[PDB]
Structures are given as structure tokens and as C-alpha cells.
């Protein structure tokens, strides 16, 4: 009986995205969600859903939907997939083996590239161990890769974990920035709040 459009627009048509290690998350509920407009758009270079056909999102009903948005490198889009390992997969963002949802990615060289280099996007190089699926690492303590203490001092045996992408418009196709939005659909014994455009 609930009839209103939920805000897919400000999460897709946003001006500035978050970093790789500080990916955002938006709660979505009480929705008449229309996924046909997103699927029919040709602006997305990559659109892969795992376990669900994309045309059938209209008749399905879900309880809650999670939208996660960030920006990564061109070659690193392969790492956003279940059962994958890599610099970002192991240390920044992890997908469970039983992940259900869609992955959306498109090139964003027009906004996230600067002739002098866009350094507003960060990613983690080093950490003690791989992180469990669906958690965020925000602490920026200086890494322990040696014997000598840190005491808040940067130097040998004390490596800064975060690195910055050198995004420039003249970079190769692999080095171009890409904006990635992943949708995770969870269903359980709860009153569903995200349904599709169907007349009862």
C-alpha cells in the first residue's frame, strides 16, 4: 500500500564519492523501487548481478537494500566479486561468497581527473591481516612492518598504510577512475519494505 519513490538519484547522480577504505552505506526502505530505468541506461560500462537476473528485479520484494558507493582504479574492478583476493579485496572491501545483489561501475574520468593529479581518493596498502566481509577500517595508525617502535613517528619500520591514486586525464584506460556502486539485497523473515511497481 506504500507508494513513493525512494532516492536512487542522489546516490547515483552524486557530485563527490567516498574513498575506497571509507566507502559509504545508505539505508533503503519503504520503496516502490523501479530498477528498469537503471538497467536500461547505457551509461554503465559494467553491470553484473550474482544470483538474480537483472530484468526480474521488478517483481521481487526485499526487506532492506544497502547501497555502497566508492571510486577505484580501472584494473581493480575485477576485485569486486565474490571469492576474490587482491590489494583492495583483502585490505579495503570484501564480498561474501554468498553475496546476492548487483554491481554497477562506470568510467568517471570527466569528474575525478585533474591535470595536476586528484589526491582526494585514498586506499590502504598494508594491514596486519585480511578483514572479514562487510566491515570498514578507519583507524590510521602507522603500520608495524619492523622492530623499531613508532611512538607516532613516521620512518623505517613505521609505514603509512594509506596511498593516493594519481588520477590524471592523460592516464591509460587501466588507470582511469571508475565509480562503483554495489547493491546488496537481503531477504529473511521480516515484513518486506522494498517492492516493485506492481498493481495489486
Amino acid at each position, epitope marked *: 500500500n506504500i507508494t513513493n519513490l525512494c532516492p536512487f538519484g542522489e546516490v547515483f547522480n552524486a*557530485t563527490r564519492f567516498a574513498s575506497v577504505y571509507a566507502w559509504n552505506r545508505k539505508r533503503i526502505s519503504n520503496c516502490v523501487a523501479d530498477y528498469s530505468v537503471l538497467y536500461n541506461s547505457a551509461s554503465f560500462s559494467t553491470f553484473k548481478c550474482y544470483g538474480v537476473s537483472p530484468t526480474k528485479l521488478n517483481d521481487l520484494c526485499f526487506t532492506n537494500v544497502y547501497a555502497d558507493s566508492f571510486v577505484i582504479r580501472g584494473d581493480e574492478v575485477r576485485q569486486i566479486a565474490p571469492g576474490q583476493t587482491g590489494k583492495i579485496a583483502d585490505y579495503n572491501y570484501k564480498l561474501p561468497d554468498d553475496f546476492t545483489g548487483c554491481v554497477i561501475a562506470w568510467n568517471s574520468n*570527466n*569528474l575525478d*581527473s*585533474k*591535470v595536476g593529479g*586528484n589526491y582526494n581518493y585514498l586506499y590502504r596498502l598494508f594491514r596486519k591481516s585480511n578483514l572479514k566481509p562487510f566491515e570498514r577500517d578507519i583507524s590510521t595508525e602507522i603500520y608495524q612492518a619492523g622492530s623499531t617502535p613508532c611512538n607516532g613517528v613516521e620512518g623505517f619500520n613505521c609505514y603509512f598504510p594509506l596511498q593516493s591514486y594519481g588520477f590524471q*586525464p592523460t592516464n591509460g584506460v587501466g588507470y582511469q577512475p571508475y565509480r562503483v556502486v554495489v547493491l546488496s539485497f537481503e531477504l529473511l523473515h521480516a515484513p518486506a519494505t522494498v517492492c516493485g511497481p506492481k498493481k495489486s
Partner: antibody
Amino acid sequence: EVQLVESGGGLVQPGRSLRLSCAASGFTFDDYAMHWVRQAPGKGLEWVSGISWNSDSIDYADSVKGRFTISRDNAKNSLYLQMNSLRAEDTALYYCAKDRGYEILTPASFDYWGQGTLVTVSS
Amino acid sequence: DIQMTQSPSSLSASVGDRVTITCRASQSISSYLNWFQHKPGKAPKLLIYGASSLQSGVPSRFSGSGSGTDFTLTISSLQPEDFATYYCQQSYSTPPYTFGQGTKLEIK
């Protein structure tokens, strides 16, 4: 649906300063870059200066370096442009354009403009 | 520095004609060109951002194409509201936002 109205056009002597403003009302001014464009009376468009979504990165054209100081006021949706030591070649028409992105030097173009304010540098 | 050039100088057509305006870049700009319609009586507008991406709010009659060092813009009909000057702007090289010269279009 966006509005961009400027002010500060007039008649000044060479080497004298005058102050520009530009009012934005049809969009959200706090997350876009802004640029200033110059149109000579008998020539084509020319880029002058630009500022980021916040006062972090500022770039100037080569011919206007050390003379212009582009400002910004996110509180009331208004930017500024202080021109100092004006010469006779700066008697052109100045537009107040808006950038599609949030940075100054990006492959993003200028989507919306506004009617210019004509300035003259003569006695 | 990059030099941005306009092949046509002045063109004339009819209400049911079709003309093409071309703009040549000295150095490769990788499909990062923009086209602007500057009506001499008011503020200029934007028609096509990027090589062949058409901005919302203007008729789909206009169509752009080209990449590298060769570009072209075409108008299918030249309707009685299309008389203006068209500029091609590059946004890829170190000199920021270099504009090409004008191209007057008077239909007669």
C-alpha cells in the same frame, strides 16, 4: 532554471581597480566549481580564472596572473572577482559560468552561463 | 601550448538544408571537445559536452562526432531559431579551456 546575474561593470581609468559579484539561485552553490570568461568586443571567448567547490585550488590565466583574485562566499551563494591594475585591453565582456564538476582543471565543461556585464577601460 | 582551429568561416543554408561545422585540434585531445552556441544577443549555451554526448535541454537534431585531432558538428535542418555562432573548446591540454574562433551561420 538557474540564474546567474553579475554586477560591477562601468568606466575606469587604466591601472584602477573595480569589483565584480555574481548571484546564483537556481542550484546548490556549495558543491560546484565556478569560472570567469572574457569576451572581447571583436574576438572570441577566453578563459580567465576558476575556483573549486571550496577555496582550495585556484588557477589563473597566463595573461591575468598577479592581477586578479577570485573569491567565493558559500554562505549566500555568491562569488567575486577583484581585478587590479586594469589596462586598455581589459574592456571586454565578462561572463559568470558554472562548472559541471567540483574541481577547476577537469575534462568537465561549462554547462550554464549568465548574461555578462560590460566593462570599459578608458578616459 | 595547444592551437585550436576552425575550418569554416561563414556558412549559408536554408530552412530545409543540412550543413556540417568541423573543428580541428593541432594535438590529440582524446574526444574531450565541447560545442557552444553563442547567440549574440544573450548568454551562450552548451549543446554537446564530450565528443558525442548531447546535453539535456536542447533538441536531439544536433549530433557531434570525432576523436583525436579531427572533429565535426552537423545540423540536420537549420531551423529558423538556429542562427548563431558556434565555438569548439578543448579541455585536455595544460592551457586551460582553449576556445576556437567563431563560425557565423546566416541562413539565406
